[PDB]
Design a protein around this nucleic acid. Sequence first.
RNA 1: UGUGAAC
Length: 1073
Amino acid sequence: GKYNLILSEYLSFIYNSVQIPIYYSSNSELENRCIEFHSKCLENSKNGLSLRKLFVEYNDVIENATLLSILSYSYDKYNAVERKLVKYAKGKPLEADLTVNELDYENNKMTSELFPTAEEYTDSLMDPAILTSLSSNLNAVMFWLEKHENDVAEKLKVYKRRLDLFTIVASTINKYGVPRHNAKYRYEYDVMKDKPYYLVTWANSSIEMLMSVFSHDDYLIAKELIVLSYSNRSTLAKLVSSPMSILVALVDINGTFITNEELELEFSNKYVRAIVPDQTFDELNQMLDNMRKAGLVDIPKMIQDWLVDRSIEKFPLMAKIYSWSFHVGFRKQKMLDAALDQEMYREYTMLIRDEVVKMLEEPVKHDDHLLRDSELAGLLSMSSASNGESRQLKFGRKTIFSTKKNMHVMDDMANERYTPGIIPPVNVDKPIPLGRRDVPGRRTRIIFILPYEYFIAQHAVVEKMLIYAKHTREYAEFYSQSNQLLSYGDVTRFLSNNTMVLYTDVSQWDSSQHNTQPFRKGIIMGLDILANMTNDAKVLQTLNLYKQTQINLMDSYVQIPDGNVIKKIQYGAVASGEKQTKAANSIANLALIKTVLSRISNKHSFATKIIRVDGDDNYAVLQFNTEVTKQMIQDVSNDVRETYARMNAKVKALVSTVGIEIAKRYIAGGKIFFRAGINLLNNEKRGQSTQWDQAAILYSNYIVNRLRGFETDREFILTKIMQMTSVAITGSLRLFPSERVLTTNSTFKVFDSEDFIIEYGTTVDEVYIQRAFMSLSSQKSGIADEIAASSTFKNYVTRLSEQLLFSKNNIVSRGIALTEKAKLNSYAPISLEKRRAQISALLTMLQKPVTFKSSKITINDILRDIKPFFTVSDAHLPIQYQKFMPTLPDNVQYIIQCIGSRTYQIEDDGSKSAISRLISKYSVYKPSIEELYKVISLHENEIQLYLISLGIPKIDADTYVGSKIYSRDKYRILESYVYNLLSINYGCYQLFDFNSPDLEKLIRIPFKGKIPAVTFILHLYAKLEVINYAIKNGSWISLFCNYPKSEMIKLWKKMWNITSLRSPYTNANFFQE
RNA sequence: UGUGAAC
């Protein structure tokens, strides 16, 4: 509840010259008291009278009613920031060293010197792209400083380290003044031209870094990064985090977790000697020297101090620095520069071609329906993203323009223009529009915004390839339901004194022009073999079209902006945007490693314990018939680099016997680490989400970083949420949502009142609020209705439906119409209409919570029903598992030590049910977990019609609707759906082993009947409650269940009518991955 | 309608 108290202090701190607490209650008489109190406060304020008497008079309202929000009557002129800043601006401003960056525009030159005229200006290279201002961030940091001004002992030290650092931001900012943002939170030319170009982005990165500073080490790191960053905007992250790849190889392994036959983590007390050739040390030194040549001093020394003994115990610092460098900011260059960087491949091409054949051999020979109806599948899959050009479109009786892919397909079909048989060119005549990918520390890459013809021609085939990968282990990122822990387990498994790991970064090779010929040719060669495997007209054409996309790309041309011009240049490299991007890249990366390993063996003899490709990295584990020496590692390494070199591939290739480092994860000293570099006050690009969506995302970002080792003060995060979630009523009237409105599990949830613990209404007022918020979940959009009524639209929905099913439509048909009515949300005008409606509904709701016919059951209601039938009792669970993920906070880590962890993802889509499998065999349609959930619970006769309506044969439809499996699917679908509603795969929970024997003992549930659904919820509810207590208290409890038999039948009915909740908090988890 | 592909 501390959030509400914190909000008042912040408002009082921000405004000084009134606040009006607004309450509400589920009890009629109490609510009137709430209404009376609100009126009196407004009246007293409208008379400059003391509200002290009213608070005493309506003590009962303060005591029992629930705080809904807070009114903010502030008559200033959004200044204060200018006034506040000066006290902290005593230090000497920073002077940009305009000689550090290559490309001139990457140097912190005055904005004007980069864009002499307002028409040449662009924030494209520094846009924070976030719906929160620099001024607000400054206010937030200062508010925190004032609060922890009179702190003591170590808390004071944290404040002192922070006050210093913020002085640098303040001193530098004051020298030019605080950049004023516009309604869209953008920084225009007039505000910008006086100040240094990167001033605002740099401030956001520095503020984010300093508020995440605690120990002296954090302070040393933050200070170096902040100062260096102001001048260097292109190699500081790379220089700072480059020594990590060398370091993982150094640390010794003293007991680590491995993967057993049951694909689960298991402790192994083994010891593995880290063997490092002297050459590696020279390479590490050059890296350290390079950091030094760039001004770095404190960070280089820390790596150096660590290097004396290299203890996994003092490794945390190395990890901390690696996470830290990313928070310098994104490297946003100019489209042209990002674009510009871009006989022995016979073995490599053949492998790519063979791999393509294996993944589609069976689907093609059989005459897979999905391959035959590939076009239909592409249409259903189709998104609402950009197609490339902004077309003029006529809907019903309205002429509007859009770039949306969904919109383009409908307009073309309604005008005989829809022609997926013809795969448009992407050369000099029809240049590919370009998109961009910005990441911290790494160089900017370009993106192909190809026409929808390409997505349809590639969607069915890519899915078939993914399915092959799903059950192929070499493909770490696609295998089974696995998570990163299993991958961590696999590398450690075979580590011994007679084996060495070989990791390699292949991000540069994928963009290499050397790469593109063997790539497209390899896929095409594979496609021809597949074509000679069948005669099916549908299969050959879908297969043939795929061949065409590769051929068109072979020689493409790109539209690269160059100021306010769009120079068209011949791009001869494999950029990404295709449907086969990830699958193809994976196939290629794996093919490349196989090629390198094969070449090397002619010289040395080793065993291939494991080979893996995961993202932009690939690796292998080799076993030699003798003990590995420093000399052996050098010889293997030189040859591997040499093999890569002959192929003209600029890749990083290292060889060790203890660790490995890759973009997604790193394994040092037998432990697993995950970079914690998600930026907070700076985004990659601008989207269409709201401020509330953004606040939820920032919190989500904060949670992931905190789990990964990077923690930003919670109070600062809370302060940001308060600014972001507020709503202006007028110019001097601002409304701030309460903790209850923000955290309760509703459609407006932004964060959990307590980190790592998700609460669900257990009081009437909480329930009353939850029901009210849902009442106004989805808002109307005129523009969306018009187009939803247009002919071209209905025909498109009708055309899709008549191509899919055979018999009758509606559970499926109603869905297709909506799925399409939604895709119109990418369309700004529609998105804008929805937001305005949401704010007005929200403004009224905060003012005085409306009524609601309810009648809609949710997850919270099911939980609320159960709660009262459990008896708690202190219990004890000894810690028995060693730590493998060193960065986890203490409360989260403790649960793992006691109950354990898992290496998989709980099925939350229902894709593993028989009905879903049956639909898949005959239909290209893909029902969601929710649709499957409604369908399974239907009358036997109805289910048979639905399966047949989708193309499922009668002998098959009939056999299923009675069988054991159908009854079983019922339980499995609900189980999958419930896990989905409980976020058992996100945040903290995704880590915990929900089937721990130790966890199980704490749950005593006596069966008083035997009805699967009820049994499953009671055990799950108990496991979550027991775990949450452990997260919040550190000690365990035992749960006993005395749930009636009469009660269980009522509960079971309730279970099959649960409504899913949509909210910023829900969206944020989806957003993360 | 400052809007920028596969996931």
